[PDB]
Design a protein around this ligand. Structure first.
Ligand SMILES: [Mg+2]
Ligand SMILES: [Mg+2]
Ligand SMILES: [Zn+2]
Lengths: 168, 203, 74, 820, 58, 52
RNA sequence: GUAUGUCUAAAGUUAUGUGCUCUUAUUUACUAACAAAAUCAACAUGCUAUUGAAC
RNA sequence: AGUGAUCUAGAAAG
């Protein structure tokens, strides 16, 4: 049958509601329904280095990795996930997790990247204050230097222009 | 944007591997440089064919004449002088008056000869021999324990697959010539069976 | 790279000759053309420049190629 | 074999024959190899066997230019000091023009991120950037390589040059400065086009009115003739020699600027692994290339006209002529060349000959090139687009006169400069035997017929201008208009490019691209579309194929699923919001009679039709035609002039309230007077040629190259079309009958909206993350669109379709519809 | 999607349930082994769990 | 003897190779420039001469 | 276009030395081979300047 | 004062 098949065959006795209830009773005993991680395909989000064997892993390399939902949530609301790969040379497990507040990632185990909810709420309020809000003689001495530099540039350029005429 | 000495050495070592038509590979090493800049750096400073040596008196005469015959056309003048252009412009003007980590990645990449899937293939071969030696050693332990397990033959990938120990697989006997081979045939049979008994008892 | 190789020798047709056909009816082998045929047996003075004053065996330099490039690149 | 395959696949592509999507870009690849290979061979042969231009030709060209610029008392452009008054305005115009590219893009590669970095640096630090630009102008003479790419336009590929961004800032400043100072110093005479003062349709209108207003032009009783010569200056840009260019430029600009320009052309050109130095010929992609092109064009103009007639056309330097005017009729009728203009490389000349002057020119030509066979009619270029009755009639005397006129003009310019050929020339004659005068300009095919030559003066629709004798204000000729065939092929290639690049994409994007293309065609050509039946056929096919892209996105071409309400309903009601031109009746006529003469519209073909017969409005009914725009603009601006003089006399403001009602009329619109940018826009000289030259610098250039909204104003208004499509589809209550609207349980449509009105897109963090692009527009997702129109997409009365029922529901699907 | 979430679909699970009811079929490798042995009463099914431990240690 | 083929585009085995392996004017131009230089001199001297 | 590979269940041994019950997606949701060439629709109808202690 | 001229249509794999 094709990929986009519309109908699947149900036996004539099939009650969907009883079937779901029976399958729910069954699901608590199946191995692969209760294992702690989901296998996924993902790209390496940043350049990283394995700590066991010093192998460099570039960004955008594809891996077969394990996804874990963590117990902790960002501001008790948003899901955080650990993402675990294994080093291509030495097969050692490298792990990193999402960082929703930064909209970024942070390293956990096996590797190194190349280059508190109350406190977070307070920091966010202060950040919003900076967002909405967005030495005197030293600045004046810098304005003096800037005005001198501006007016001298024309004489420098005119010296170059005359030099070009002399060279010609 | 200044070029460091380490970046120049990385570029030369990279061009030794990749040639002068794969600058995106060169720039994948030089972390702060683009391919465009790397091609510029090679073609105008680091290519060994470039002649940066001091001008002869004849060259100064030639350069001044060409600068009159082809005014401001410095890439053309340079191609005729067989020298870099910025050299010709400077000469014409004279006559008329943490980085260790990048190098580590560079050496690691450039001295890697294998590529990805060949590396995975030698890893696979290592794992296969590990499993084979596992079976062999386990069989030896069980043989010392006095329970003589037989070695498992490999599984046939397809129904007509061959075990090369059961038969001489496509036997092409030598065509019989004029000379009688019988005596040395029975001698060879003696040799082979002697070797078989020897490997049975001595290993 | 080792999956990606040139052809050292071509497959010999002697191998296909070694076993029999397996009865698949191909459309192009159905009957057709079943009978053989057989043979019988003043204003023009004011300007500076007025008059008052092939085949080659290289495809790329041929006049057709020059005209083609002037037509299709612009 | 490779070059043979390239030839064959190019022919298939330009025919419209079947070609694979990958094969098109493969052909682009092969052909760009072959073009670079041939250009390298040309450059090397120039170096080996020497320059095309002889020393004698060079010295006399230099003498002609010197004589002109001395007779004009031209003061050469100096180098700009840092004290120069207009420095910040010139630089801000340059940086705005540069930033306009990246304000409309999202595929920002490293070079184009570096571009915006340097642009914001420059906006922050004007003096620093001025100083940097000027020291580079004084000192820098070696430049980074230029990458070339080719753009697949399906009739022909076209080059695009990528210059280094840091160099590009300097070149943009120099281009702006040179065009400003050249307008201030009156370098370029009135005949050089495009101009800041005219959009291209207004150039065609002013050219036709100018022809009609020459004295005695239409009289033929004494055997007079009028001849109109159109030809391209072939290979003009690529034959520019750099030493001749440098010594020519030194007559008009400072030596530092001339040397900078000259060195900047002598650069390495790269494409993949191909590389060569450009040793000869102008690189069209340099930002100042338009200036070089027009000045070299002025050299060729002076060779064509001669010193005397050039001074006649331009007038005395202290009060020059406006375009096509003369200081008196005595100056006008002194010399046969009555009119000249050049649009880039296309020259246009009108010659008015006495009968004996024509005889003299013709017998000279026949003295050197006699024709005993009367073979001269063979290969005479003639306008296919008009009937045999009304195109040029190939009489012996007129054919020979036209060939003589060309044969005279071809001698006047050396082949080393430009390639003027008969195969790229059109020469129409108006005479006792020929009543029609024909030319093609800016994509408009024009045919002028005087009222005294019409056998019967009928009334006409839009697409026929009446030409007015300005002495009496009486109508005295008609100009019939069509779109040029190459412009029809360009439009077809554009729709074809949209169709190819739109595999498995959002439907509203396809609709938006179609809308942009259709609007750009209709707002440019306007009334010339009416009399152009091949374009109507192409339009119908294009709209059908655009709808077919949507239909094949939904894996079903079946008409009954997709009534006009699905496509033409506006976006805020969940439709695609397409604009229509294809639901017209197409004029039909006997093919033989139409080849021979103007048959008139005897019959009508059906255009696009749907069983749900609805009177969908057309785009054409909401655009004011150019004749009416230009006449209303003349009235409007004269009225404004009188109002301005009385306001000056009162010494009070000529008020907004006093010009309301005239606010959104005129070319340029009256609104342009009062925009806040008026004081900075005043210095942006040369903007129109700059906008047209962007095709050589930028991939995916704008379709509205011909008008600048800042300078011309908003020249169309399609707000009414939305209201009229809503009423045409039976009103809003009829439109929502096709939709899943009542499945929501909402009582009434009004007060409902799609966008969820979140504040995130106003966040400073979002601004930091998306600063490059403006984001007012919104697409409809394909699955939401399919679900919204599901009662009609999954209707019951399908032509065929296997009836299946969705699992554990009573919903029936009639066939397979994706995403539903 | 992958083999695993196809095999753990409701239809497949229901067919597994119906097969263990209608014919006694049960692929024990699908199911988690009992932690405490004594809750298992049949000699047949206890021996099958023993077989699972055997293939696991192999 | 056929030399070893060293490509500037390809390196199948990833060999680092010795770098050196990985790596007149027509008279008309002179005549043209000389003629234009003389024409310029004519222009200068003519405008200077009639400046009086 | 939702990769794919290996493994094992084998056989016992081949002879000698049912409850309750939440649900307005409260899902660890999974796949990317597919496509990317986006600009018509913009933008208001008229431009700003302000306060030092004490002898 | 009205004669007529009427294309389509969907499934798989990639
Ligand atoms: Mg694939
Ligand atoms: Mg495939
Ligand atoms: Zn490792």
């Amino acid at each position: 049958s094709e990929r986009k098949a519309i109908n699947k065959y149900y036996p004539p006795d099939y009650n969907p509601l009883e079937a779901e209830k029976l399958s729910r009773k069954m699901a608590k005993k199946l191995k692969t329904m209760n294992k702690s991680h989901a296998s996924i395909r993902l790209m390496t989000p940043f350049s990283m280095r394995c700590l066991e064997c010093n192998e460099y892993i570039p960004k955008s390399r594809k891996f077969n990795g394990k996804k874990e939902l963590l117990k902790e949530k960002y501001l008790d609301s948003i899901k955080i996930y650990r993402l675990t790969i294994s080093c291509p040379r030495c097969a050692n497990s490298i792990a990193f997790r999402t960082d929703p507040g930064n909209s970024d990632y942070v390293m956990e185990v096996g590797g190194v990247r190349n280059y508190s909810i109350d406190e977070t709420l307070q920091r966010l309020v202060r950040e919003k204050e900076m967002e909405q809000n967005e030495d005197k003689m030293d600045l004046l001495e810098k304005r003096l230097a800037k005005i001198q530099q501006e007016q001298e540039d024309d004489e420098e350029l005119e010296n170059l222009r005359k030099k070009n005429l002399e060279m010609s | 944007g200044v070029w460091t000495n380490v970046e120049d050495q990385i570029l030369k070592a990279a061009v030794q591997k990749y040639g002068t038509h794969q600058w995106s590979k060169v720039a994948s090493l030089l972390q702060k440089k683009t391919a465009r800049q790397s091609e510029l750096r090679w073609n105008e400073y680091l290519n060994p064919k470039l002649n940066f040596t001091e001008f002869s008196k004849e060259e100064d005469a030639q350069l001044l004449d060409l600068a009159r015959e082809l005014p401001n056309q410095w890439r053309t003048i340079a191609d005729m002088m067989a020298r870099p252009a910025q050299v010709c412009v400077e000469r014409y003007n004279r006559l008329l008056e943490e980085e260790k980590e990048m190098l580590a990645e560079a050496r690691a990449r450039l001295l890697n000869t294998q590529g990805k899937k060949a590396t995975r293939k030698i890893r696979e071969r290592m794992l296969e021999e590990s499993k084979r030696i596992a079976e062999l050693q386990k069989r030896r332990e069980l043989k010392q324990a006095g329970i003589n397990v037989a070695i498992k033959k490999p599984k046939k990938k397809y129904g007509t697959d061959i075990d090369y120990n059961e038969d001489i697989v496509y036997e092409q006997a030598p065509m019989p010539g004029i000379y009688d081979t019988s005596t040395e045939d029975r001698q060879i049979k003696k040799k082979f069976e002697q070797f078989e008994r020897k490997v049975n008892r001595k290993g | 790279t080792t999956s990606h190789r040139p052809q050292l020798e071509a497959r010999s047709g002697a191998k296909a000759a070694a076993y029999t056909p397996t009865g698949i009816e191909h459309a192009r082998l159905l009957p057709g053309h079943t009978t053989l045929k057989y043979r019988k047996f003043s204003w023009r003075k004011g300007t500076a420049f007025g008059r008052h004053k092939g085949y080659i065996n290289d495809m790329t330099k041929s006049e057709y190629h020059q005209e083609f490039l002037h037509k299709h690149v612009r | 074999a490779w070059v043979s395959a390239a030839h064959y696949n190019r022919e298939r592509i330009k025919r419209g024959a079947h070609v694979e999507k990958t094969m098109v870009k493969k052909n682009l690849g092969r052909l760009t190899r072959l073009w670079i290979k041939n250009e390298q061979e040309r450059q090397r042969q120039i170096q080996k066997n020497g320059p095309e231009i002889t020393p004698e030709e060079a010295t006399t060209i230099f003498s002609v230019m010197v004589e002109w610029l001395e007779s004009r008392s031209f003061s050469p452009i100096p180098f700009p000091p840092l004290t120069y008054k207009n420095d910040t305005k010139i630089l801000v115009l340059a940086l705005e023009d540069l930033k306009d590219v990246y304000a409309s893009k999202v595929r920002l590669n490293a070079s184009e991120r570096e571009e915006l970095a340097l642009i914001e640096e420059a906006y922050d630090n004007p003096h620093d950037t001025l100083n940097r630009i000027k020291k580079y102008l004084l000192t820098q003479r070696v430049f980074k390589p230029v990458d070339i790419t080719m753009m697949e336009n399906y009739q022909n590929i076209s080059p695009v040059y990528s210059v280094d961004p840091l160099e590009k800032i300097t070149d943009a400043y120099l281009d702006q400065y040179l065009w400003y100072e050249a307008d201030q110093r009156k370098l370029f005479p009135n005949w050089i086009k495009p101009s800041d003062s005219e959009i291209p349709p207004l150039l065609v209108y002013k050219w036709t009115q100018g022809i009609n207003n020459l004295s005695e032009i239409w009289d033929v009783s004494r055997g007079q003739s009028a001849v109109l010569l159109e030809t391209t200056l072939g290979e003009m840009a690529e034959k520019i020699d750099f030493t001749l260019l440098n010594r020519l430029l030194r007559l008009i600009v400072d030596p530092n600027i001339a040397d900078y320009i000259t060195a900047k052309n002598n650069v390495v050109i790269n494409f993949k692994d191909m590389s060569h130095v450009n040793k000869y010929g102008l690189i069209r992609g340099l930002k100042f290339a338009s200036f070089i092109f027009q000045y070299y064009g002025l050299v060729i103009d002076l060779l064509l006209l001669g010193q005397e007639r050039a001074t006649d056309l331009a007038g005395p330097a202290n009060n020059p002529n406006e375009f096509m005017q003369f200081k008196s009729k005595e100056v006008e009728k002194a010399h046969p060349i009555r009119l000249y203009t050049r649009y880039l490389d296309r020259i246009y000349m009108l010659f008015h000959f006495e009968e004996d002057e024509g005889e003299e020119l013709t017998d000279e030509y026949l003295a050197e090139n006699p024709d005993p066979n009367f073979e001269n009619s063979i290969g005479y270029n003639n306008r296919k687009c008009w009937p045999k009755d009304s195109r040029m009639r190939l009489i012996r005397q007129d054919v020979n006169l036209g060939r003589a006129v060309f044969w005279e003009i071809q001698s006047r310019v050396p082949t080393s400069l430009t390639s003027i050929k008969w195969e790229n020339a059109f020469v129409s004659v108006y005479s006792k035997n020929n009543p029609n005068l024909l030319f093609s300009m800016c994509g408009f095919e024009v045919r002028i017929l005087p009222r005294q030559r019409m056998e019967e003066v009928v009334s006409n629709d839009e697409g026929v201008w009446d030409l007015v004798d300005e002495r009496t204000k009486q109508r005295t000729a008609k100009a019939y208009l069509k779109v040029s065939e190459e412009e029809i092929k360009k439009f077809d290639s554009r729709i074809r490019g949209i169709l190819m690049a739109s595999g498995s994409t959002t439907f509203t994007k396809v609709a938006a691209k179609w809308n942009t293309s259709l609007i750009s065609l209709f707002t440019y050509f306007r009334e010339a579309i009416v009399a152009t039946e091949p374009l109507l056929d192409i339009l119908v096919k294009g709209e059908t194929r655009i709808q077919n892209r949507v239909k094949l996105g939904l894996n079903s071409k079946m008409p009954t699923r997709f009534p006009p309400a699905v496509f033409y309903t506006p976006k805020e009601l969940g439709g695609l919001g397409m604009i229509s031109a294809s639901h017209i009746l197409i004029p039909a006529s006997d093919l033989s009679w139409s080849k021979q003469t103007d048959t008139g519209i005897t019959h009508f073909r059906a255009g696009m039709t749907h069983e749900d017969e609805k009177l969908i409005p057309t785009i054409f009914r909401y655009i004011t035609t150019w004749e009416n725009e230009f006449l209303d603009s003349q009235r409007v601006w004269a009225e404004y002039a009188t109002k301005r003089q009385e306001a000056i006399q009162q010494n009070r403001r000529l008020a907004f309230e006093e010009l309301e009602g005239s606010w959104d009329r005129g070319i340029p619109r009256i609104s342009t007077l009062f925009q806040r940018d008026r004081h900075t826009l005043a210095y942006d000289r040369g903007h129109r040629i700059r906008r047209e030259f962007k095709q050589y610098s930028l991939e995916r250039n704008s379709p509205f190259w011909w008008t600048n909204s800042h300078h011309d104003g908003k020249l169309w208004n399609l707000n009414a079309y939305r209201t009229d499509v809503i009423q045409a589809l039976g009103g809003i209550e009829t439109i929502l009958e096709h939709t899943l609207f009542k499945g929501t349980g909402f009582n009434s449509w009004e007060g409902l909206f799609w966008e969820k009105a979140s504040g995130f897109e106003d966040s400073m963090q979002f601004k930091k993350l998306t600063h490059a692009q403006r984001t007012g527009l919104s697409q409809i997702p394909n699955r939401r669109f399919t679900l919204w129109w599901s009662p009609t997409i999954n209707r019951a009365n399908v032509y065929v379709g296997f009836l299946v029922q969705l699992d554990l529901t009573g919903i029936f699907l009639h066939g397979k519809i994706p995403t539903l | 999607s992958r083999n695993v979430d196809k095999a753990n679909s409701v239809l497949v699970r229901f067919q597994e349930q119906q097969a263990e009811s209608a014919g006694g079929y049960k692929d024990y490798s699908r199911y988690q082994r009992p932690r405490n042995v004594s809750k298992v009463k049949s000699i047949k099914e206890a021996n099958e769990w023993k077989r699972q431990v055997s293939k696991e240690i192999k | 003897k056929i030399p070893a083929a060293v490509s500037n585009w390809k390196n199948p085995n990833g060999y680092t190779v010795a770098l050196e392996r990985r790596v007149t004017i027509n008279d008309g131009f002179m005549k043209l420039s000389e003629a234009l230089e003389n024409a310029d001199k004519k222009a200068r001297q003519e405008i200077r001469s009639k400046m009086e």
